[PDB]
Design a protein around this ligand. Sequence first.
Ligand SMILES: [Cu+2]
Ligand SMILES: [Cu+2]
Length: 128
Amino acid sequence: AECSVDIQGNDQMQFNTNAITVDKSCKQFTVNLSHPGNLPKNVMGHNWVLSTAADMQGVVTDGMASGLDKDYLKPDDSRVIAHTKLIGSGEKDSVTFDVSKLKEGEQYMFFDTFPGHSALMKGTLTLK
Ligand SMILES: [Cu+2]
Ligand SMILES: [Cu+2]
């Protein structure tokens, strides 16, 4: 099975997809994030952040409260399973994580924690 996915976030506060599936037989999984557009990070920064569905609200609320110099994530937030950096237009960042962190029967969400973006920039992550 493939073990990576390419995700884009644009100047329109959109991701290219709202559903990612991770095949069990992957030991690691990589998300490659890019930002088409022209807007810089402080105004249209995007990141890809993974937690359980239950934790998504907290991560987003705490991240937004943390500010740009924290890339909009609360320091030491243990609800965050994996994430990319916050990137502005033209930049790119990849994260690779251990698939063993993810458990059967759990609901996962990926999302962006830049202020307001999770309204649109979120999706499900499913183990298969
Ligand atoms: Cu494979
Ligand atoms: Cu964003």
